[PDB]
């Protein structure tokens, strides 16, 4: 008898063993299934911090920006401060000027105004760190033939290398730049002053190294010198009424 | 002899059983890492996702505030254009109020001169939506106990209701105020014009609609009427001189 059961429990272990085996199979399945479902998600998650990482560059882009537009506005702020403030039409031209020096890098700041019709020029203001030769220090002359003469009419602001661009300046005027080449100048600067609807004179900076000048940074010195040109008009005027 | 065959067979079958019940278990919890390294990563999924809508809001912040700081200095621009460019005082001041207009809301604009020795104020210029009763144009008039005279010495922008604030504006004046509100106005903003280190005039504007004035407005404000400020001195001395 115990024949009859050996071959009947040998019939149904084969059994269980293939049940066994198909529990095996569906469970590899699943694994790979979930081994599939993972390797998708480590790829979600590596586009992820990528997106995050262009948004956190875009945030640094639009954060320099917003301090440069803050700058500016503040530069422009101070501008109209002082000239709402100061009185004295030198300690007015010296704040301004001082301002510009400490964001703009440069040694000496001069004021030209322009008489039109004598065709020359004249010295309003001026904040040098030298001493000029007696021989160069006209507070009135000439403009007749002169780069003046020539970009009395600008509306873009003028940036120059010394010993690089001093022919553009004709010959006039090449003795004052080969002199200021010699105390370390490198760069000039030119800003034109409008205030009617005429240039009544000149911005003008020297620098003894040369700054690389961005068209944002042309722009607002442009912008300050509106401020200054109005300025040195009505200074102009009041020192017309008080004589 | 088959039978000793069958419980030896029935004996590894039972062996091979056990095995493939282990090879199960294992399965099993290879599958439960997976579910549970899955696990983590829909959360980490999740996080990044918020990350990246905090940042996404932190960008529009930062677009909404550099526009701001945009306008603010386009506007400074074309003020500072217009004082550069215009010849006509008439034409200056209406092209600089008109561009305040169409971004602070208002419908009549004025620009008052002060005479603080006098105690006298005068109407420099003036663009009126509306015609005034003959009886309040006074091109000149007193300053003394008014308001005007209270509020000569500002530094910031005052913006006041009409109806609600026009007591603290004195019994002077309450006739226009009063007026002002039967032509349906609800709103003045007054802004003291500062040039020498006083206050030289003020600029004055009335709207049908109470505006929400922010400290941002305030501040654009009082910026505009730093370079009207000073065109306005430049005025009144070319006006002196031509005389």
């Given at each position: ?137 006209h507070q009135t002359r000439s403009i007749a ?27 006039d005027g090449a003795p004052l ?67």
């Amino acid at each position: 008898e115990f024949i009859n059961k050996a071959v009947q429990q040998n019939k149904e272990l084969n059994f269980k063993l293939r049940e066994k085996q198909n529990e095996i199979f569906e469970l590899k399945k699943i694994a790979e299934t979930l081994r599939s479902k993972l390797e998708k998600y480590v790829d979600i998650t590596k586009k992820l911090e990528d997106q995050n990482l262009n948004l956190q560059i875009k945030i640094s882009d639009l954060e320099k920006k917003l301090s440069d537009a803050n700058s500016a506005l503040k530069l422009m702020q101070y501008i109209g401060d002082a000239i709402g403030t100061i009185r004295d039409p030198q300690e007015l031209f010296r704040t301004v000027t001082d301002k510009l020096r400490l964001l703009f890098a440069f040694d000496s700041a001069v004021i030209i105004t322009i008489d039109r019709e004598r065709r020359e020029a004249s010295v309003f203001f001026e904040m040098l760190r030298f001493e000029l030769p007696e021989q160069l220090r006209h507070q009135t002359r000439s403009i007749a033939g002169t780069w003046l003469e020539g970009h009395l009419d600008d509306r873009t602001v003028t940036v120059a290398s010394i010993a690089r661009d001093i022919p553009s300046f004709g010959a006039d005027g090449a003795p004052l730049l080969w002199t200021l080449h010699e105390l370390g100048m490198r760069q000039i600067v030119l800003s034109p002053l409008r205030s009617g609807g005429r240039v009544i004179g000149f911005l003008s900076f020297v620098s003894a190294e040369e700054k690389l000048w961005s068209d944002g940074d042309k722009s607002l010195l442009s912008g300050v010198s509106s401020s200054i040109a109005i300025a040195v008009s009505n200074a102009l005027a009041y020192e017309a009424l008080r004589q």
